[PDB]
Amino acid sequence: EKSVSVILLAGPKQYIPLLGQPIALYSFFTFSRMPEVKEIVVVCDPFFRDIFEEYEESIDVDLSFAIPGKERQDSVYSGLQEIDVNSELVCIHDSARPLVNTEDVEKVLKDGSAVGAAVLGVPAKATIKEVNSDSLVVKTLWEMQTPQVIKPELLKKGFELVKSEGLEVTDDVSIVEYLKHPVYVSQGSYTNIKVTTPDDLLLAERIL
Amino acid sequence: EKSVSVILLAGPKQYIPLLGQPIALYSFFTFSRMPEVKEIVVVCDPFFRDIFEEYEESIDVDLSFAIPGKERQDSVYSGLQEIDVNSELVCIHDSARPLVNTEDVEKVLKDGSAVGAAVLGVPAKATIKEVNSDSLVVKTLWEMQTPQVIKPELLKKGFELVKSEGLEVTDDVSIVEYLKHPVYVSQGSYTNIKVTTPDDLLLAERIL
Ligand SMILES: Oc1c(Br)cccc1-c1[nH]c(Br)c(Br)c1Br
Ligand SMILES: Oc1c(Br)cccc1-c1[nH]c(Br)c(Br)c1Br
Ligand SMILES: [Cl-]
Numbered sequence: 001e002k003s004v005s006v007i008l009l010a011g012p013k014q015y016i017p018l019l020g021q022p023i024a025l026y027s028f029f030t031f032s033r034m035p036e037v038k039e040i041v042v043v044c045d046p047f048f049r050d051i052f053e054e055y056e057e058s059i060d061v062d063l064s065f066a067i068p069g070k071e072r073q074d075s076v077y078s079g080l081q082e083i084d085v086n087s088e089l090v091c092i093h094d095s096a097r098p099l100v101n102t103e104d105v106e107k108v109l110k111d112g113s114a115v116g117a118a119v120l121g122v123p124a125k126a127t128i129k130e131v132n133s134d135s136l137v138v139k140t141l142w143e144m145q146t147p148q149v150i151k152p153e154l155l156k157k158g159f160e161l162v163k164s165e166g167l168e169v170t171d172d173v174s175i176v177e178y179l180k181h182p183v184y185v186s187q188g189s190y191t192n193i194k195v196t197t198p199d200d201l202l203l204a205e206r207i208l
Numbered sequence: 209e210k211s212v213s214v215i216l217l218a219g220p221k222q223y224i225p226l227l228g229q230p231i232a233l234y235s236f237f238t239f240s241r242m243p244e245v246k247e248i249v250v251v252c253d254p255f256f257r258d259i260f261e262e263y264e265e266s267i268d269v270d271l272s273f274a275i276p277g278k279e280r281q282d283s284v285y286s287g288l289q290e291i292d293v294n295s296e297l298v299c300i301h302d303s304a305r306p307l308v309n310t311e312d313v314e315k316v317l318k319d320g321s322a323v324g325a326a327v328l329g330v331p332a333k334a335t336i337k338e339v340n341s342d343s344l345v346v347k348t349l350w351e352m353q354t355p356q357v358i359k360p361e362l363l364k365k366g367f368e369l370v371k372s373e374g375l376e377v378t379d380d381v382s383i384v385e386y387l388k389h390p391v392y393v394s395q396g397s398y399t400n401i402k403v404t405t406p407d408d409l410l411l412a413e414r415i416l
């Protein structure tokens with residue numbers, strides 16, 4: 001209870017409405033109702049701060065703010081600097097995923113608490129193959145969603161490793177791929193889509 | 209010119225209409241206009257034969273029919289038994305992909321002709337990871353579409369290998385993954401989606 005800090009990445013496609021609520025608020029509220037969650041650090045341009053501070057008084061979590069950075073890992077680092085000195089888990093979430101279920105968030109929190117690092121994923125429905133640099137097929141795969149859940153010590157150690165050795169963070173060379181510490185994949189729901197198109201937004205409403 | 213036989217897998221989500229033409233006819237017509245294409249072998253339940261034989265007289269290819277099998281590889285084998293004794297390439301296509309562009313089909317035909325086996329693919333937009341049997345992340349990926357283009361000798365040799373050794377054909381352990389012969393991945397278009405949902409069908413119309 002009150003052990004988890006959420007870093008909510010909200011820095012424009014995550015403020016466009018879905019039944020008249022900006023997409024970013026769906027997951028915001030889902031996290032605010034979970035007794036495990038102590039605080040939510042929203043990482044957004046100071047413009048849209050009010051979109052969230054409006055509800056500060058009704059929600060049952062502390063709210064905090066951080067400024068976005070250049071790339072997604074900068075924004076996480078920025079959020080991390082504002083979490084509570086004693087939180088046991090950091091829960092990083094892309095606000096463009098509105099439909100994450102409370103039950104799936106409980107699952108990945110539990111797994112992150114057990115393993116140290118966990119991510120919600122689903123089996124990749126497409127036929128996916130590795131291709132080499134000559135465009136030839138190189139003779140089980142999962143799609144990663146968010147939350148991505150990590151103990152704060154591990155995250156901080158991960159940022160230090162990258163800075164200390166000027167490592168390259170690609171989308172698929174994560175910070176955690178550099179650590180030897182294991183990352184668990186918690187099985188989520190195919191309904192936890194990311195919103196980036198109007199046809200995504202039709203799906204969103206079809207699902208709600 | 210007239211060197212390619214198409215095996216069109218059409219064996220119900222590929223007959224539902226898209227601007228009032230059953231989905232299966234879009235690619236059927238795309239192939240029928242290409243001078244390279246000699247014949248199209250439609251693999252469908254004898255029910256819907258008429259959906260295609262109606263146009264037999266206007267299209268500029270020979271039309272042939274084969275009966276579906278248990279699994280997708282059975283239906284390809286069934287189609288293969290009806291191709292022309294002298295075709296140089298077999299072009300296998302899922303009729304649930306209506307929007308394949310003529311230019312992308314020309315590309316994968318050329319690559320299959322050069323390499324012996326080619327498939328239209330696109331870089332996988334999701335973050336995809338390998339996961340082991342303990343659900344831990346195992347520390348370039350492409351989504352395969354169709355056509356899948358293969359010289360007929362190679363396909364036949366591939367079917368013989370599987371039967372000869374009772375190998376297991378999963379969706380992702382293809383017949384071609386058993387061969388030592390290389391498979392080229394021709395870069396396609398993200399618009400070459402597969403139709404399986406109404407939201408897919410909204411995308412289809414949004415794209416046309
Ligand atoms: O990708 C992760 C997985 Br998979 C599991 C736990 C944490 C992460 C993660 N996500 C981001 Br954005 C950062 Br920076 C980090 Br570390
Ligand atoms: O997957 C393929 C690639 Br990738 C490239 C060429 C041919 C194939 C293929 N597709 C199917 Br269905 C069969 Br049976 C075969 Br062999
Ligand atoms: Cl990411």
Ligand SMILES: [Cl-]
Pocket residue numbers: 280379
């Ligand atoms: Cl397949």
Ligand SMILES: [K+]
Pocket residue numbers: 031032033034035036037038060061
């Ligand atoms: K709470």
Ligand SMILES: [K+]
Pocket residue numbers: 096097098099100191192193194
């Ligand atoms: K979602």
Ligand SMILES: [K+]
Pocket residue numbers: 023024025026027028094095096097098099
């Ligand atoms: K959201």
Ligand SMILES: [K+]
Pocket residue numbers: 099100101104105188189191192
């Ligand atoms: K979910």
Ligand SMILES: [K+]
Pocket residue numbers: 114
């Ligand atoms: K445990």
Ligand SMILES: [K+]
Pocket residue numbers: 194196197200
């Ligand atoms: K999308």
Ligand SMILES: [K+]
Pocket residue numbers: 239240241242243244245246268269
């Ligand atoms: K033709």
Ligand SMILES: [K+]
Pocket residue numbers: 304305306307308399400401402
């Ligand atoms: K298509």
Ligand SMILES: [K+]
Pocket residue numbers: 231232233234235236302303304305306307
């Ligand atoms: K079609």
Ligand SMILES: [K+]
Pocket residue numbers: 307308309312313396397399400
């Ligand atoms: K295409």
Ligand SMILES: [K+]
Pocket residue numbers: 322
């Ligand atoms: K060549």
Ligand SMILES: [K+]
Pocket residue numbers: 402404405408
């Ligand atoms: K789909």
